[model samples]
Target: RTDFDLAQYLQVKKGVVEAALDSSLAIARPEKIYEAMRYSLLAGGKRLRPILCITACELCGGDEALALPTACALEMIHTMSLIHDDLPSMDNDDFRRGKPTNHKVYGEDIAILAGDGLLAYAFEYVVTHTPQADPQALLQVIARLGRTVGAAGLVGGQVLDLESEGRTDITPETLTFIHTHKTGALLEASVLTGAILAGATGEQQQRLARYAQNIGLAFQVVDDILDITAKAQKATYPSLLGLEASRAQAQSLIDQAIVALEPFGPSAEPLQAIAEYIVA
Candidate 1:
């Protein structure tokens, strides 16, 4: 048995993340727009993005406190993506984090504005709030942040995923490509940005990239399995590979994800524990 209190780790980190996230946004002029943004932004997901962000920084010997602004920005980016993805023109899920989607509650216009607000605010918050670390490194983080949300990363794969919806020929390769960008990009960005903040060497960044990529896909595969079993299917890995096969894939990915951290010390336990938790 492992000694790392995985549950407690999550509980503690989640509280830290929640506090930073709660303080991220405030009521401004034109309260409804801010309201819409805050609605989904603070609706409370598992806070994995923010936790991974802060943990990655700590794993790289950076102070967790210094990463809080960026950590919160990452979650804001995620929430913005969620708000947009739930739009009528997009996946049209009409629900998120066990509550009504932004568009549903605030009308499509405000929801769009809300997503825009979060997107813009993410950059502003990170740039303005992040204490003077290394300006160059901070710029690097912002550059990666911009790419993470744009067509080369999250947005590109989203378009592909949307286009392929209910297609007669949804191959495993195609699905993987879509998620590698849509889902994997931000997950990769989550760790890489933190690594960059702490000045991780190129080799370490490479290893962390591998770790994030595997877990990112594994995360999606596991999501597919749960969705399939949960009376929910979302054109995912389970549809391409059988449910059993999907499970095996997730297992293998988690194995690779953990191994990528082999060179690190006890500080990496959080990342290792999170990788296993993805499938466990």
Candidate 2:
């Protein structure tokens, strides 16, 4: 516990994730399509979702190797979301992670297909590559994965967000609903998928789920603040709660997340760091 260093742990996991992503899509025959997929998939960010999955598996006393495939899949799914979100039909952003977006580089049609490719391959990668987990547990993870990406999760959230665009009547609850599903759902799934794969008990998974939810919202809260600071116009916590209230809410969620880990004791130090890392 005391020996754990957050920076060192993150660096190691980021390197592992980087290598896995590089090899995941190998510049296949449909050259442009694969290139577009790889372009955004490999663009660097915090890699938080996959790292959360790996750490959660380890905390549950599962082999990291067993979780690695699913970890990579989590990132693939996240990358797919980003690719689609940046499209002309969506956010219409020309840049991501400091580079031109997929559509900018490869045209909108191929960019859309690239997102489709990554999303499809993510499921295939988890199914084919996750090894030696309980069959039932694996199936549950797959189901959750499907739900996380579908209409009930990210897609639903995105639709609501799109509808709320430029509407002055959005409520706090509506904003929370949008982000909790769009951003928080995937983050929640990242933790739960690892716990399910590791065969976490009902009680343990429940606590972790709460922890995931708290931090998931906390992550979005911080992003909202950041966007406000960047002067981006969107429905966000600061927009609804005020900047100070938003900050307090984020901290409260982080506190709740830490308390959820009380059952895991010191082995959850990394998880604790992860909760703090969002705003730190």
Candidate 3:
């Protein structure tokens, strides 16, 4: 087994993601809107979505230049979701990633528009900015992104989650529906989008999809664990399940996740590090 330097890898990827985010923002028309978009964009994050997408694409033998814009789009989509998720009606969170929630810093109305702008801009970013690839392939990538972020995926899960709030009647199955869709959907989409962009074969994509799903769930599970155990400086997924089970589930899923990538050989090192970090 190859020992990986996850921090070094993450550091390099963060620079890449941040640069892409900045470059994409440079094209935003109407100066005021660009400023708002930049506020959220430059605002700091681990950029996990971008890292996942970029690494997945590279792992599948995809072109980094071709995948860069789309990878940045995933970051925009994720950050936008976070902006909305922290709203008063949603998680009611005041702090996020160690800063005031978007709505708090920008006020509710502006924050809402900021998120909407990012969401809308994400498609624009993907379609207009993605590198030279087949138009049909690009179109399909956009379509998948739409479906994942819209009714059948992320938004649908949010609807279920909002409906279930404060009702102790929530079943584990229902919880799965919310988690898988609300959170896991986009996560799955992130890896899939990259795989397709990279021209990965059906079998490769399938295995990666499974790999992404397992790690995605494990990432959330670890977040749940950290919510109770980690300090204010760290992120947590404890919004749903309690800390202990979250820890156990994260560990269990991570074990499965690493195993899932066995077929990829050396290309799987980054994926291996990602799975281990979620539970470590």
Candidate 4:
């Protein structure tokens, strides 16, 4: 088995993702909106979505160049979500990734437009930049991206999450629904879009999808634990299932996620690292 250096892998990919993201958007007229978009977009984080998009493409023998555009698009979508999620009407968060939230720094009007611009640009980036990919595959990924961000996915999930807030009667099933759609949907899109672009076989795509689903839920489960340990507000797995139970649940999900990738062998090292990293 090839021992993957997780840090080296992440650093290398993060560099690529950052450069692509930086160049993806232009500092156009109406400078504040563009600045706000670039502000949150460039702000550093794990860049996990883009990394998964590129890694999954590589794992399926797809050209990394062909995947880069979609990877950037994925990050844009994620950044857009964060910007809107931090608004006063949403989570009302004042900070993210250790910086003042988008609305805090740019004012609510510009922040909203920034998120809107990012969302629109994400689709434009994929369509304009993925010229080397099969047209059908490109269209499919575009469709998935739409659903990932729209009412059927993130929007619906966010609505439910808001409705469920401060309510003690929330069922475990409902909580799963919220996280799977809000968080897991985009994560799943990040993985599957790459696979789709790479022309992965049906079975391969299915396995990847399952792996993404497990890790997606696990990622949220870990976040729930963090909210409790770090003293943040939000209904979370720890609150619903208790801390120990939530930890066990996350571990179980990661174990299953690893199992789903066994067929891919060492090519899946980065993904395995990611699953472990989420819990860590």
Candidate 5:
């Protein structure tokens, strides 16, 4: 009775994102830096952020062609963070999904610049590649993207997270702040940037933010729960709220996320499916 073909849908989008990522960055003078950037950026990932960006853009009646560049930019920022997050100064453990982390393979110095290069290049790519969009809308998205990367967004989240680690005594609100900033900020930007490029209405923008924010929380909550199975560290939702309460929290957040876009009907099925999969 219901067939979204989500598996195939995800596969197709992954292919498109991978191709764009590969073609977007070319190794040139000072090839080492570019190689380091591409190495981590192209390494296997679900490409979830870019897919969400494309999905949000299409849901808002924008062409996929217009959204692709911004989608790629979101992934570049995401990858940059991933690279830095693994540095000796941070998590420090050497491995991301079985491959040596960027710093491990490229050495800490090159890895840092690799992330740095990707971040600076991401802004340039979005500005240049998103041809023929409303100039103001593009800039608006850029400003928001820049904000998400700095202290107000991911960095703030990271700082709080580092402080909170190894301490079981954390307020749920504080935990939420950590996850929302560290995880949700980029996820919010992932979806919001696309809609902005498509010129979403103020009402549409509000709904999308609600949608992104809720699902972003759900994503982390589920991660926290699963971390138990992996026997993980860091203060987590399960630690604060208990496993049962944590699951309920994830379910409720996902419910809110799904409900946020109910007005969009069939056009929202992709996001709805993605939201459901967060807990599934």
Candidate 6:
């Protein structure tokens, strides 16, 4: 599966990702929380975050050994976020991606602890486990992870989202703020981390950052459109904005995302493919 048959390529990706995830969280010292963390990490979603990081890293010339831990860490952070978001005190979701939420299966305390465990261990996973081209690059990855998931990024976006919940005060900047940090920050970090691993040129890194930011918003734009069109049972931009506006915004962001790839020529194919796939 890992070698590359496009037909089963996705399966290979899932197996590799899921195996590493299961191994990393194997119960040893912290048996209970570790188990809980593993459950959510392997819960079977698209695993987009890890896949993005891995693909981005490869486009920048990083090897699997080097990108593995970072890819896993990205998924860990995403899973941790979901675990917390599903808590009664948070989004209070009963089901997630169509399955019973973490709290529902594991009790609130364990669920919270599981989120905390994965989040704290994500950096550890990158530091101790993710192979790097060099020590300097490893340090950069650590710092990037911290910044992306910390207050300046995803967490900050969540704060704004909470404040704006069900309110009519939304604006363009507000929309950007919520989407960028909420989803954009981690994605931007994912691409940047990949570029950094490859010792990317400054211009390369910047373009990748723009790529992430653009799709991050576009991804949300689609989410918004889905909410309105399919009644996807999730909070979305279209739910807040009209469906037409959300659709237009998605296209705008996608165009912007594609423009960011102009510097790479053929190297940017995957990025372009991903952009189209997200909005398709």
Residue 201 alpha-carbon offset, candidate 5, angstroms? 1.1
lDDT of 1: 0.87
Q: Per-residue lDDT tens digits of candidate 2, residues 30-105?
A: 7888888888888889999999999999999886788888999999999989989999888899988789999999
Worst 10-residue lDDT window, candidate 5: 228-237
Give the Cα-based TM-score of candidate 2 against the true structure.
Answer: 0.95
Per-model TM-score, in order, reads 0.94, 0.95, 0.88, 0.95, 0.96, 0.91
lDDT of 1 by residue, 1-280 (tens): 4567888888988898888777877788998998898899889868888888888988998877778788888898998899899898877887776798999999999999999989898899888987766999999999999999999999998998877766778888888999889988999999988888898999999989999999999988887888889823346787778998999989999999999998886778889999999887
Model 6 clash pairs are none
Give per-residue lDDT, candidate 2, residue 119: 91
Displacement of residue 54 (Cα, Å) in model 2 is 0.4
Itemize residue pairs with steric clashes in candidate 1: none
Runs in model 2 lying further than 4 Å from the true structure: 230-233
Worst 10 residues of 1 by lDDT: 231-240
For all candidates in order, the CA lDDT equals 0.87, 0.88, 0.79, 0.90, 0.90, 0.81
Can you list the residue pairs that collide in candidate 5? none
What does the lDDT read for residue 76 in candidate 3? 88
Residues 132-231, candidate 3, lDDT per residue (tens digit)? 8678778888998889888788999889877775675665457666778887888887888888888888898787878777887776666556556651
Deviation in Å, model 6, residue 235 alpha carbon: 9.2
Q: Comparing 5 and 6 by TM-score, which wins?
A: 5
